[PDB]
Amino acid sequence: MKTIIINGVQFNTDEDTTILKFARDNNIDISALCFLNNCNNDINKCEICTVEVEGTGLVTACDTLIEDGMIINTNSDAVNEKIKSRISQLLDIHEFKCGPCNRRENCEFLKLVIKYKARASKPFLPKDKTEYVDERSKSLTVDRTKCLLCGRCVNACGKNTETYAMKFLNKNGKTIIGAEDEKCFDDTNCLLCGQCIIACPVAALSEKSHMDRVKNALNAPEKHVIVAMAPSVRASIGELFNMGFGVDVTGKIYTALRQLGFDKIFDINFGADMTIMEEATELVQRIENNGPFPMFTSCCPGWVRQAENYYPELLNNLSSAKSPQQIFGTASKTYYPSISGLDPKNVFTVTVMPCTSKKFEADRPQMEKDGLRDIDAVITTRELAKMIKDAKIPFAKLEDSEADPAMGEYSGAGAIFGATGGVMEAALRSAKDFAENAELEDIEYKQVRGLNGIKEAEVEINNNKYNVAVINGASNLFKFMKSGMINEKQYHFIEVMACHGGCVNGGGQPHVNPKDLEKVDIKKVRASVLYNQDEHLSKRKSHENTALVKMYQNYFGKPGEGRAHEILHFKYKK
Numbered sequence: 001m002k003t004i005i006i007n008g009v010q011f012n013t014d015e016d017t018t019i020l021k022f023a024r025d026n027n028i029d030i031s032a033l034c035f036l037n038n039c040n041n042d043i044n045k046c047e048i049c050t051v052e053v054e055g056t057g058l059v060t061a062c063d064t065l066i067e068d069g070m071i072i073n074t075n076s077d078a079v080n081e082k083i084k085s086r087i088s089q090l091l092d093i094h095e096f097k098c099g100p101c102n103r104r105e106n107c108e109f110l111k112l113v114i115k116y117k118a119r120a121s122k123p124f125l126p127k128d129k130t131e132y133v134d135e136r137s138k139s140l141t142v143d144r145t146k147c148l149l150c151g152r153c154v155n156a157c158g159k160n161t162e163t164y165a166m167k168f169l170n171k172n173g174k175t176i177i178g179a180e181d182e183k184c185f186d187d188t189n190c191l192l193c194g195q196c197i198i199a200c201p202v203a204a205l206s207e208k209s210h211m212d213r214v215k216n217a218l219n220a221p222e223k224h225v226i227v228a229m230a231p232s233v234r235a236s237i238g239e240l241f242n243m244g245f246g247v248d249v250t251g252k253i254y255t256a257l258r259q260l261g262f263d264k265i266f267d268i269n270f271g272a273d274m275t276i277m278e279e280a281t282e283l284v285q286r287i288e289n290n291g292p293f294p295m296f297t298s299c300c301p302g303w304v305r306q307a308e309n310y311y312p313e314l315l316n317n318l319s320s321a322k323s324p325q326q327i328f329g330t331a332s333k334t335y336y337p338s339i340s341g342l343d344p345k346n347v348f349t350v351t352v353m354p355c356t357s358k359k360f361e362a363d364r365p366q367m368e369k370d371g372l373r374d375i376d377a378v379i380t381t382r383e384l385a386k387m388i389k390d391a392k393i394p395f396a397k398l399e400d401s402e403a404d405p406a407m408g409e410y411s412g413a414g415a416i417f418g419a420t421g422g423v424m425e426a427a428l429r430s431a432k433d434f435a436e437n438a439e440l441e442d443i444e445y446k447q448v449r450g451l452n453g454i455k456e457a458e459v460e461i462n463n464n465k466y467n468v469a470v471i472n473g474a475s476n477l478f479k480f481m482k483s484g485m486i487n488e489k490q491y492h493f494i495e496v497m498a499c500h501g502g503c504v505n506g507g508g509q510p511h512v513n514p515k516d517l518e519k520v521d522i523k524k525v526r527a528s529v530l531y532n533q534d535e536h537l538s539k540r541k542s543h544e545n546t547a548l549v550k551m552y553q554n555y556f557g558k559p560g561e562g563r564a565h566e567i568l569h570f571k572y573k574k
C-alpha cells in the first residue's frame with residue numbers, strides 16, 4: 001500500500017490515482033475548475049486545485065499522482081492565497097455582472113469567487129461587447145467576456161465528437177476559443193451538438209436564443225402558438241427547480257406551458273410516433289427492394305451534419321422520414337388546421353428540445369412548404385426553464401394537467417426516443433409488426449439499450465435475419481466507420497445519436513455541476529424516466545397511437561406513400 005497524510009489524517013491505500021480524486025473519495029474538499037472529463041487545461045492550468053505537499057511545494061491535485069510518504073495540506077494560507085490569486089486574475093478578464101447572466105443560478109466560477117472572497121485587481125468592464133460576442137450561428141453563441149480559457153469546451157468537443165471544431169485561436173496575439181479560422185460554427189465541420197456548452201462552467205457558451213421569437217408570437221393577437229416538448233424535456237427540466245434528478249415532471253410542464261400563455265399544448269413524442277410510422281414502413285420497403293442498405297436514422301441533426309461534413313456518400317442512405325420535430329411541424333401547418341379551422345399562416349409552432357442543433361434543423365431553408373415553416377421556433381430546456389422562472393411560475397408546486405390529445409398523445413415507443421437505442425427499439429416494434437403483419441407481444445429490445453458506445457444486435461423479421469447497430473455518440477460514429485466495423489458485416493438499419501447517452505444528454509440540457517456528475521449517472525437517471533413511461537403505458541407501439549391513427553386515416557392515408565411521403569419526408573443529397 002501507500003501511506004498518505006492529508007491535513008493530519010493518515011490514509012493507507014493501494015490505489016493509483018490523483019490527489020484530487022483520492023480526496024474526493026474521502027470527503028476531503030479540494031476546489032477545481034478546468035478539470036473535467038478526466039482532463040484539465042494542459043497548456044494553461046488554472047491551478048484552482050492547488051495543494052501543498054511537504055518536500056515539493058504547491059502542486060495541482062487534478063493531475064498529480066498520490067505517492068507513499070506524501071504529507072498533503074489543502075487549506076494552508078499559502079494554498080488559499082495562491083488559489084485566491086488565480087481567481088482574482090481570472091476576474092481581471094471576466095465581466096462580473098451576475099444579475100442578467102443566464103448562469104446566475106448555477107455558475108462554477110461565481111461559487112469559487114464567493115468561496116475564496118476573491119476580487120479583481122481591476123474590474124473587467126468592456127464598453128462594447130461587440131468584438132467579444134459571436135451570435136452568427138443558429139445554434140451557438142459565444143460571449144468571450146465570460147470565458148475563462150479553461151479549455152473544457154475544447155476538450156469536451158474532442159472527446160464527444162472527435163471533430164475538434166472548438167479550437168484555441170490566436171486573435172491579434174490574444175488567446176480565445178472558437179471555430180476554425182474564427183468562422184461561424186455553422187460554416188465549419190461543427191455538429192452544433194452543444195456539448196461545448198454543457199462543459200462550460202460559465203455563461204461564455206450559450207444557445208442561440210429563440211425566446212424573442214416565442215414571446216413576440218405569444219403577445220401577437222392573431223398568432224396561435226403551439227408548443228410541444230421533446231421526450232427528454234420531461235425528465236430533466238425538474239433539475240433547474242431544485243427537484244433533483246430523474247424526476248418525471250410531464251404533467252407539471254403542461255400546466256406551466258398553459259400559464260405561460262401557449263394556445264395549444266401538444267407533444268413531440270406524438271411526432272416521434274409519426275417518424276416511426278414513416279421510418280418503419282421505409283425499412284420494410286427497403287427490405288423488399290433489397291436496399292439501399294444500410295438505412296441510417298435521420299432524426300439527429302448533429303448526425304446529419306456529421307454525415308454532411310464527413311460522410312456525404314451516406315446521405316442517400318439516411319431515412320427520408322423527417323425528424324419527430326420537423327415531422328410534427330409539417331403536420332402542425334396542414335393537419336391541425338384541417339381539424340381546428342385555424343389559418344395555417346397564423347399557426348406558430350414552437351418546440352422545447354434538449355438540443356442546440358435542433359435550432360439549425362428548424363431554420364433549414366427547405367424545412368417548409370407553401371411559405372410555412374415546419375417549425376417557427378426552438379427553445380432549449382434551459383430556455384423554457386428561464387421562461388418559467390421569469391413568469392414567476394411555482395413549477396415544483398404545480399398540479400398535473402394533460403396535453404391536448406389531437407397531437408399530444410404518444411405511445412411508449414415514442415417515449416423512449418430521448419435515450420440511445422430508443423429510436424432503434426421503437427422502430428423495430430413497428431417494423432416487425434408491419435413486415436410480419438401481426439401484433440407481437442415481445443417488444444422489449446434491451447440489447448440496443450445502455451451507454452455502450454457501439455451496440456449491435458441480430459433481429460429476425462419475417463423469417464429472415466437482419467443486423468442492426470446503434471451508434472451512441474458522434475465520436476463513436478467516427479470509430480465505427482474508421483475502424484471498418486461498417487464493412488465487417490451487412491447492416492440493415494443503424495441508429496446514430498451525436499450526444500453520448502442520447503438526447504437526454506443533449507447540448508440544450510440543464511448544466512450539472514462536476515460534483516454531481518460524480519454522484520449521479522445523469523444519462524441513465526434521465527433515460528430511466530423515459531423507459532418507466534414506456535413500461536406503464538397502454539400503447540407501447542407507435543402505430544397503436546389512436547390520435548395518430550385518426551390523423552393518418554382522415555388526412556395522410558398510408559405511411560410511406562401518397563400524401564404522407566409527399567410532405568412528411570425530407571431527403572439529403574451531396
Ligand code: SF4
Nearest residue numbers: 097098101107110203
Ligand atoms: S458567468 Fe458566472 S460569475 Fe460571470 S457574471 Fe455570469 S453568473 Fe456571474
Ligand code: SF4
Nearest residue numbers: 147148149150151153
Ligand atoms: S467557453 Fe467556457 S469551457 Fe470554453 S474556455 Fe471559455 S469558460 Fe472554458
Ligand code: SF4
Nearest residue numbers: 157191192193194196
Ligand atoms: S457544438 Fe459539438 S461539434 Fe460543435 S464545437 Fe461544440 S462540441 Fe464541437
Ligand code: SF4
Nearest residue numbers: 300302355499503506
Ligand atoms: S443526440 Fe439528440 S440532443 Fe444530441 S445533437 Fe442529436 S438530436 Fe440533438
Ligand code: FES
Nearest residue numbers: 034035047049062
Ligand atoms: S483543476 Fe487542476 S489545473 Fe485546473
Ligand SMILES: [Mg+2]
Nearest residue numbers: 039040042063
Ligand atoms: Mg492533463
Ligand SMILES: [Mg+2]
Nearest residue numbers: 218219220261
Ligand atoms: Mg397569446
